[PDB]
Amino acid sequence: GLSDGEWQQVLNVWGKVEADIAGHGQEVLIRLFTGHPETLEKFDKFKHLKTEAEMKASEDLKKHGTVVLTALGGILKKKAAAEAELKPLAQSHATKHKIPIKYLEFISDAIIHVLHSKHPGDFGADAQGAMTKALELFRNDIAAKYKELGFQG
Amino acid sequence: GLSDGEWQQVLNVWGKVEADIAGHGQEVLIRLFTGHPETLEKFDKFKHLKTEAEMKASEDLKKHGTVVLTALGGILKKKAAAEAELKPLAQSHATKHKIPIKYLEFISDAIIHVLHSKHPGDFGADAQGAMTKALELFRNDIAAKYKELGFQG
Numbered sequence: 250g251l252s253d254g255e256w257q258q259v260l261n262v263w264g265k266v267e268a269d270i271a272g273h274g275q276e277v278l279i280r281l282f283t284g285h286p287e288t289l290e291k292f293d294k295f296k297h298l299k300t301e302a303e304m305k306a307s308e309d310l311k312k313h314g315t316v317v318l319t320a321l322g323g324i325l326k327k328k329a330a331a332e333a334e335l336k337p338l339a340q341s342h343a344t345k346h347k348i349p350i351k352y353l354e355f356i357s358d359a360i361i362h363v364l365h366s367k368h369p370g371d372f373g374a375d376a377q378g379a380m381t382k383a384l385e386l387f388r389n390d391i392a393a394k395y396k397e398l399g400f401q402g
Numbered sequence: 403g404l405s406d407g408e409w410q411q412v413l414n415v416w417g418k419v420e421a422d423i424a425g426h427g428q429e430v431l432i433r434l435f436t437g438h439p440e441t442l443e444k445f446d447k448f449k450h451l452k453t454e455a456e457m458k459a460s461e462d463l464k465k466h467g468t469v470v471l472t473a474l475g476g477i478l479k480k481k482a483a484a485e486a487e488l489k490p491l492a493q494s495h496a497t498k499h500k501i502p503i504k505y506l507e508f509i510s511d512a513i514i515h516v517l518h519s520k521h522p523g524d525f526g527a528d529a530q531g532a533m534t535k536a537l538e539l540f541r542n543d544i545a546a547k548y549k550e551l552g553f554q555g
């Protein structure tokens with residue numbers, strides 16, 4: 250995992266990418282296609298390009314580079330936000346409170362029960378299965394962070 | 403993980419929790435502490451709480467329930483958002499474009515390369531390391547989705 254400052258670093262440098270996304274996207278695809286020409290075969294629009302000069306002149310390749318870095322930007326920003334919610338919890342519950350994963354399971358079961366009890370009409374089998382999985386993913390994500398922090402169980 | 407359908411069911415029920423969060427939080431903690439007294443032992447600040455009546459009368463247990471469910475809501479909402487960005491990309495790159503993980507490694511290195519070339523003074527070792535790690539997590543996250551989809555990346 251990344252630390253808090255490392256995630257902010259990622260976001261800061263993506264700010265610079267977005268300030269000139271056309272140029273960044275061009276240079277990234279050109280670096281890819283020249284360093285690793287076998288990757289060009291995947292692109293039915295680009296594979297005919299042979300030289301870096303041709304790649305720089307391609308309007309299609311510039312557009313795609315922007316598509317790619319836009320999508321990656323969103324992925325990174327939303328991953329960082331998710332980790333910003335999870336990390337503080339993992340940190341306190343591993344280091345100060347010392348809460349085993351099993352106990353997170355117990356509270357998960359309690360949540361599921363209270364939901365089913367209070368909202369039987371809106372928390373049928375499909376919903377209940379979805380929440381079960383969501384809380385399991387949450388526990389697995391916390392467990393991994395625990396391990397990094399030197400807290401096992 | 404979950405589908406977008408399953409994340410929607412999760413987020414929909416969570417709106418009903420938010421509607422009446424204090425009661426939900428109280429009932430979750432009481433269910434937990436009553437089923438699992440060992441969990442109550444972890445709350446040195448709730449050691450005065452011996453019976454259901456006392457738990458129900460506690461200012462601070464009610465406030466804590468709300469803190470817990472508000473934090474979990476944020477974790478779930480931001481996790482769902484992160485997944486909703488990553489899943490479509492994994493899906494197309496697995497099923498349609500058939501992009502090996504190795505090629506995702508190549509573009510990752512290209513990104514790092516271009517960032518260093520364009521921001522030589524700003525993108526030093528520590529920032530490069532942060533970005534290296536974030537792209538590795540991105541690739542691992544894709545890989546996990548590839549497997550769900552039956553694609554060998």
Ligand code: HEM
Binds near residue numbers: 294316491
């Ligand atoms: C950072 C990594 C990547 C991101 C964020 C990214 C993103 C995207 C996006 C947003 C699209 C358009 C929508 C879609 O089909 O999903 C796309 C299309 C595509 N991607 Fe990727 N991609 C990445 C890596 C790769 C790599 C390494 C390859 C091949 C070596 C590749 C091959 C393709 C192909 C062939 C298309 C369809 C292009 C077209 O016909 O217009 N992608 N990519």
Ligand code: HEM
Binds near residue numbers: 337338357
């Ligand atoms: C869904 C699971 C959980 C969430 C979202 C959660 C959230 C929180 C939050 C937001 C705080 C306040 C800030 C902090 O210290 O990190 C907190 C404190 C705390 N939590 Fe949790 N928690 C969860 C599960 C548990 C479980 C299962 C236990 C114990 C068995 C536990 C024990 C504690 C303790 C002891 C504190 C400190 C209370 C104090 O003395 O003020 N947590 N938790």
